[model samples]
Target chain A: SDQNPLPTRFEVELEFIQSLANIQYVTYLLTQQQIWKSPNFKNYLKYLEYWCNPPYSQCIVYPNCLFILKLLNGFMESAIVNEDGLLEGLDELP
Target chain B: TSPSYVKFFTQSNLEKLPKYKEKKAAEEITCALDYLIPPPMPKNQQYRAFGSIW
Candidate 1:
């Protein structure tokens, strides 16, 4: 969860590190030592990099999102082909 | 139906059906009417609000 105490602290550390990195490339040495072990900090940094591009877009289409959308599509397709033809599916069969 | 069938004599005779005594009688009537007829609905579950529209 985003609200988890470990991740919250790590997120703060990551922000500090990235901001310091911008000032001087050598500053990365100090920042890296501080937040290298943070929980999900790498994933958060991936998102942060994508968000802070020159054109300013923060949208992310992660692999998990694609997988879920695919699963939902399959579910809906089967739902439309059910016996009652509504609110059910071939997915309902054992 | 005759008026005599529906009408009961007032507090004049102690043997007659009793009439309500203002606020005190109202309270007693309300208390007696509190017999349970149906169950109540359960409380709703709490959820975090995600700001994303998609």
Candidate 2:
């Protein structure tokens, strides 16, 4: 017989990553929690690029998260260089 | 109803993908929440805010 189909953490991470996909929520996170400057958080975003790969990528329904992940990655590197640009991008996205 | 952008997939179906590979051990899986520590705690508590449409 099959064991548990998916781990609980999968659901948690899926929602969390999708939440990061949200432009307003990302802003709220930084404004509220301010984890952007965090080295560990940066590394987590870096490692999270793994989700951009297969199997996981296939599971995603909201493809916007993939592009948001790329933008957030730049936030890890340049910090300010593209975050404002992201604001511009979002403003233009609507 | 769930968000229109979010969809569900079955584990059995996911295993059929060409790139699918089962991770045999717990050590092989890298979950996003595992690394959270002092990194994500709020610096200051804030009041609620929500969109008007919602």
Candidate 3:
């Protein structure tokens, strides 16, 4: 039987953000000094504004990931602290 | 995902799927957000100086 082909761009992005739900992965992003230090990475985070679009937001399964993505886009040094802070911080965002 | 929810994703499976009552609600939420932000203005309107410059 013919199977569905590749996922849509939206689906691909949805999966990427969904992975952020893993505290370990969030820690890794925080630990990677280069990812934070690089100007391009900052722009990359800013570029994630595309995901804030309604069509993409609607497709999300885990809404908390979106909240994290928003915080990351801002690139705050204080927003994500330890692992507990990552989860706890998200609870406060509207 | 619920079986019905999964079915909604594929054309082939849609025949077997039951009605999606909350689907409309979800759509409205998406619509509301879209309205709140609105997409970018049209390309023609993007640059104020484009036509006037040359």
Candidate 4:
């Protein structure tokens, strides 16, 4: 069998991502960069970008997922900038 | 019938099947519901709104 075959369906997974509009999910992902950097999973994220196109996107169960995906992309871009500040902000000890 | 039962007609599928026109209507319903029941709010705001009313 082909390893890392594309998922059989996108709806369920897309719905789960759309649910991440909750801030807790954003915090969860901020703590998990390893998954984003993985080769196969990164490919999977690129595969999911098909939803951004018009013809395929029309069938989507949660179009908001597409919107959130864009925001997530933005998050990834900024996370590097914040990495140092993220670590430095703990200096308030007595 | 379930909304999930609705078929997904990719552009290639549309080209190969000339008789299929219902996809537009299905797509309209899809867009409608995306707006209808939106995702949840941030946790703090969720508690704040409910906390005072209780």
Candidate 5:
């Protein structure tokens, strides 16, 4: 018998495959539109380069870009609030 | 003893200030006070959401 039982769950495999498909579709469309050549795309690429170098395809591919934008805005705000000046306030002892 | 020492430090620090030091230190003190006793949050940012209020 050449049977071998699966070790990890099938659900994990499905999720990984789904994520891969999402990324590939995103890359294909961006490439097809010649979008990477545009100035806005270039600017977004630059921003992605600085923030999350090589942006997550899932994020760029998603229809609701506003959700991703809100997420990034929150991140930027968190970074600013946790800056060096505010470190003193956080240093308070218990 | 501590009361006498508190005035000696605080009052002497104030009295010894040069013109520019007086200006800068005054500003810093004012800034720290403003930071501590901050003004109320702006009405727009601290909004009463329309549904909740009305």
Candidate 6:
């Protein structure tokens, strides 16, 4: 999964901007993948926030990105009004 | 808290910017569906069938 270093600069980075706003994808990245529990990943999320400015912000298509970008910054308990489930006693698989 | 957040902390502070301090100290969060609703894909994303046809 390593080796490329970076890109000439396009599709892959654009894909991340597009993908970052998918709520379900983020939920999976958060819960199933345990992204937030790591400082490096948290740092990486910090790195990703520059898309909020001009130039880069223009390519974004998915809606909820700004909020989730801030969420990845860990500024709140959790987002309100999830018609979907969240942390509580969903504690066991059996 | 400490000056740990450069981006998130929006301070050295502002307009009673400690407001966010209070906000961060609380127990709820909110977001909006303010952005444009994505168009129903032709046969790709979530909503494939038309409202009338489905």
Q: Pick the candidate with the highest TM-score.
A: 2
lDDT of 1 by residue, B1-54 (tens): 111111112213222223322333561124221111111212332211123233
Clashes of each: 0, 0, 0, 0, 0, 0
lDDT tens digits, residues B1-54, model 6? 111221232213233443544664680123211111111112333322122210
Q: What's each prediction's TM-score?
A: 0.19, 0.47, 0.43, 0.37, 0.19, 0.42
Instruction: State the displacement of the C-alpha of residue B1, model 5, in Å, after optimal TM-score superposition.
Output: 73
lDDT scores in order: 0.27, 0.46, 0.45, 0.41, 0.29, 0.42
Winner on TM-score (2 vs 4): 2
lDDT of 3 by residue, A1-94 (tens): 8998885333454456667666667666655543433333444444445656654455455666667778776656454444333433544443
Q: Write the per-residue lDDT of candidate 4 for residues A1-94, one digit (tens) a residue.
A: 6587443234344455445445666455445434433332323343355556654444454455677777666544344422323312223322
- iRMSD values, candidates in order: 30.0, 15.4, 17.3, 13.6, 24.6, 13.0
Which is the better candidate, 3 or 4, if ranked by TM-score?
3
For model 2, what is the alpha-carbon lDDT of residue B51?
A: 21
Candidate 2 per-residue lDDT over residues A2-84, each given as its tens digit: 77765344455555666666678766544533333334455555555666775456545666777888887885565542343
Q: Report the error of model 5 at residue A50, Å.
A: 4.5
**Candidate 6 per-residue C-alpha lDDT over A1-94 given as tens digits, one digit per residue, 9 for 90 to 100:** 6676643223344456457576677666554323233343444455456666544555556546756787767642342322233323322432
lDDT of 2 at A78: 55
> Which candidate would rank higher by DockQ, 3 or 6?
6
Q: In model 4, how large is the Cα lDDT of residue A13? A: 42
For model 2, residues B1-54, the per-residue Cα lDDT tens digits are 122112222233333533332332222234322232112212232311122111
Clashing residue pairs found in predicted model 5: none
Q: Per-residue alpha-carbon lDDT of model 5 for B1-54, expressed as tens digits?
A: 001111222223334434434465661234222221112222342222122100
> Which regions of candidate 6 fall more than 4 Å away from where they truly are?
A1-9, A33-37, A76-94, B1-54
Error of 3 at A11 (Å): 3.3
**DockQ-derived CAPRI band for the predicted complex in model 6:** incorrect
Query: In candidate 1, how many Å is residue A17 off?
Result: 9.6
Candidate 3: which stretches are off by over 4 Å?
A1-8, A77-94, B1-54
Candidate topping lDDT: 2
Could you give candidate 3's per-residue lDDT for residues B1-54 as a string of tens digits? 101111123333333323343453572234222222223322342222222101
User: Which of the predicted structures, 4 or 6, would earn the higher lDDT when compared with the native?
Assistant: 6
